[PDB]
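Recap slide: Zinc-alpha-2-glycoprotein, sequence and predicted structure.
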Amino acid sequence: QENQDGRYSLTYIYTGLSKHVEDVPAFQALGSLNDLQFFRYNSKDRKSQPMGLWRQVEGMEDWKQDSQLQKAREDIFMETLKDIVEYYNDSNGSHVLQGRFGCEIENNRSSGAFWKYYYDGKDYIEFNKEIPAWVPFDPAAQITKQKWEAEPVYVQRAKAYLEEECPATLRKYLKYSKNILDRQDPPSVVVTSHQAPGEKKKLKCLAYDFYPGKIDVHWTRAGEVQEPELRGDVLHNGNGTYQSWVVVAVPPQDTAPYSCHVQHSSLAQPLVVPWEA
Ligand SMILES: *[C@@H]1O[C@H](CO)[C@@H](O[C@@H]2O[C@H](CO)[C@@H](O[C@@H]3O[C@H](CO)[C@@H](O)[C@H](O[C@H]4O[C@H](CO)[C@@H](O)[C@H](O)[C@@H]4O[C@H]4O[C@H](CO)[C@@H](O)[C@H](O)[C@H]4NC(C)=O)[C@@H]3O)[C@H](O)[C@H]2NC(C)=O)[C@H](O)[C@H]1NC(C)=O
């Protein structure tokens, strides 16, 4: 009777667009606790709203207050994207600035942190909290490097936000979310055959209503494992559950037995469902 393990992750993805249409929001931000997203905010609606299972959780976060400082961040974000675009003279062109910012804890202790920006998919700038300093990866990023380090203090706060302000927020959220994130829901599995007129028969094995997401689902033909013709995976965020299915194509003659094997953490011994033809 064996391992420790309690690692939890808090991540934000920020997205801006230089050229956007009326209905499409210019700025957007969402935050995830582990693999599940707990809140979104955009520049159109201009309101911080909780998402998924976190709609029923009260008093974890002052959403009105959060909207405020989200707005603050939106300003600094787009202003940066403007500066990149203005620098490349491509004022009229559809460009993307994406920002990833986050920390994580393992066994109650800070174990890692990251703060990185991307431009049109390419590495733009990055915080090295060891120095501490920002690290340009793009010629344009030299300007931002100078702005964000204008005062020597700024670099010290950036280190503080990652190393302390973030994990502090994480733990706070964890008081309300530990129960959610720690779930070990087993999958119900369902086998289904289907025939297309001028097509080989296809056997679908669906695993559903499970969490966490890490799952092995594979077919076997008369003992040997078969490579799937197609595999599908889904996260139902409102539900806070996962769904995953695998389809194999069985030749017209084939009389050999097919069974679906599901392996998930919430199960002691593996789950096997045979296709009762
Ligand atoms: C969280 O949310 C998700 C999505 O919002 C919910 O998904 C639903 O899950 C329930 C079970 O909790 C499913 O109920 C059905 O149960 C019977 C067994 O008693 C099964 O026969 C069903 O199996 C599905 O999949 C089969 C093969 O893949 C398919 O042949 C079958 O038709 C059925 O769903 C299919 O049919 C429906 C009806 O038209 C289609 O709408 C659906 O797209 C289709 N699915 C697929 C890809 O095959 C099935 O499990 C519901 O089917 C399922 N529905 C949805 C909208 O996803 C989930 O229930 C919920 N969980 C919790 C814990 O709250």
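DSSP finds three helices and 16 strands in the chain.
The CA atoms of residues 222 and 257 lie 5 Å apart.
(End of recap.)
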